[PDB]
Amino acid sequence: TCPIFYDVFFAVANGNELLLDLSLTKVAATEPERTAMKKIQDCYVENGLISRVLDGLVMTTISSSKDCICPAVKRDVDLFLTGTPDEYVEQVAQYKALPVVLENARILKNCVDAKMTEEDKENALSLLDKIYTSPLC
Amino acid sequence: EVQLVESGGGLVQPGGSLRLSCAASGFTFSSYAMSWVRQAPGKGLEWVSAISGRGYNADYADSVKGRFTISRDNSKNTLYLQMNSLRAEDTAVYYCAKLEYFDYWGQGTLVTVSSASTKGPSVFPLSTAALGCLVKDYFPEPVTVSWNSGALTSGVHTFPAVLQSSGLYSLSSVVTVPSSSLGTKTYTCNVDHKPSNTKVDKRVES
Amino acid sequence: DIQMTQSPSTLSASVGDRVTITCRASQSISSWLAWYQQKPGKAPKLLIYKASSLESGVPSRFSGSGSGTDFTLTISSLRPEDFATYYCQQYNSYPLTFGGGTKVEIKRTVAAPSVFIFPPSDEQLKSGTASVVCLLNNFYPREAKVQWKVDNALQSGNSQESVTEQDSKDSTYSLSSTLTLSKADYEKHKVYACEVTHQGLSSPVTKSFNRGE
Ligand SMILES: [Ca+2]
């Protein structure tokens, strides 16, 4: 179910810029859309391996929930980008409430809010909108 | 337009070094991954290295790992490839290419790895008859061979050069002619080797 | 490391004919495959990306198809410009890997080679080396056997060969085989011959000489 999304997210989270450039080519992303996803990747790279591992735990437990392209997963991503830090972390808490996961949740969410402008936030969503409405998805 | 222009290739000895350059223009360089692809004489294409948009990550072919270093200067729109500990195997045309599937290539730059110094060739002579010259023990490529100062192009065959175990190249050029024009008419080959500034004329006769 | 197996490595066709080049990946690459055309002395040109998407400017007689592990490049109605070498390339993951190549060549009628043999010159012998060369002029197809014998001793490992590409006039090949010996070893044997076997000949042609002529 929606393989092309999870390949882009995995390419963002894993922190390798070259493998992300490959993903962005595969999904015909524009130069502003590329810029915005690389700023998201910087947050995983700056906050280390466990940011990938604990956010992978989060994305996994949402995707295998009762609620589940899953609208719960779509909702998680929009909150991560456009919601407030308390909104995102409280939403993550309903799926998994380990102190270390909520700690990691807030560290990433603060990073992207500090690092991305509103233009970058809008572009990440427009690139996501393409992915969600693709026939591959 | 989108232009990619390689430079820095040339002759190197085995063990030595080379820095290739690729000035790019016509697109926002920093948004895209660039690769280097190569091609040995009469062989296929081979991906050698790639580097991400801002240069935080790179990958290499196993044969080239640890020897080669790919890099870029995003302020100058230039891609680099420092090639160290070069081997006979690395002799090739090196192209820079945009993206991960190569929409735009450069015209390449040739890299030749050999122990040999630049050296001019020795030229030896060789119903319908055939005659020729054997062009021997030169380096590097290329050699060009015309016949009777370009006046005889009909039925002329010049062969791809073979790299001998000495490290020096060797080829032959042959032409077929009518049997009864042997003693009467002069058949001379003009062998130019522009790398050594050597030209050789060689008359051929039974 | 994804291996790309391209087949066949060679085919000869005519103008108007259909041409199908298969290419297969050792593991799945979804639709992330590209196709290239390369002419002598030139950089490759992109034809297809994403398995079946035609690059702009490329004529529509070129098409691609396939998914997963098996991919096809078909030319509908072959034109003179389309005689070239063709390559597949996966961009599913790094390292990026190419197929071995497929040479598309001009089909013509079978033609036997005119065999010649050239003794080493008196000039070369004085420098101290001896190169005997055997010419195979104007033939088709390329597949051809060339044995060397010195006093009937079947030779190997002391000769290399070069082949031209198809001639522009008549679509034929020419080959040379070059037996290289020292002056000392050369002058210890009398008779030198090259035996050429080829599709266009009913028996194998031999061509020889004695040192001294
Ligand atoms: Ca998330």
Residue numbers in the entry:
A (entry chain F): 6 to 73, 94 to 162
B (entry chain H): 1 to 126, 136 to 215
C (entry chain L): 1 to 213
Q: What sentences appear in the manuscript?
A:
Fel d 1 is the main driver of cat allergy and has multiple immunogenic epitopes, but is small in size, 18 kDa. To determine whether monoclonal antibodies could block allergen binding to IgE as well or better than those naturally produced during SIT, we generated Fel d 1-specific, fully human monoclonal antibodies using Regeneron’s VelocImmune human antibody mouse platform. Therefore, we screened more than 300 antibodies, and selected two antibodies, REGN1908 and REGN1909, with optimal binding and blocking profiles for development.
Surface plasmon resonance (SPR)-Biacore binding studies demonstrated that REGN1908 and REGN1909 each bound with subnanomolar affinity to rFel d 1.mmh and natural Fel d 1 (nFel d 1), and sequential binding assays confirmed independent, non-competitive binding to nFel d 1. The Fel d 1 peptide regions protected from amide exchange by REGN1908 and REGN1909 revealed a discontinuous epitope for REGN1908, predominantly in Chain 1, and a single linear epitope for REGN1909 in Chain 2. To further refine the specificity of REGN1909 binding, an X-ray crystal structure of the Fab fragment of REGN1909 bound to Fel d 1 was resolved. This structure revealed that REGN1909 contacts multiple residues in the HDX-protected peptide, along with several additional contacts to Fel d 1 residues in a Chain 2 peptide not detected by HDX. Interestingly, REGN1908 and REGN1909, the two most potent blocking antibodies, bind to conformational Fel d 1 epitopes. In a similar model using cat hair extract, REGN1908–1909 also blocked cutaneous anaphylaxis, establishing that Fel d 1 predominately drives cat hair extract-induced mast cell degranulation in this model. These data reveal that REGN1908 and REGN1909 must be administered together to achieve efficacy in the PCA model, demonstrating that multiple Fel d 1 epitopes must be bound to prevent Fel d 1-induced crosslinking of polyclonal IgE and subsequent effector cell activation. The presumed mechanism of REGN1908–1909 is blockade of allergen binding to IgE:FcεR on mast cells (and other effector cells) by the injection of competing allergen-specific IgG4 antibodies.
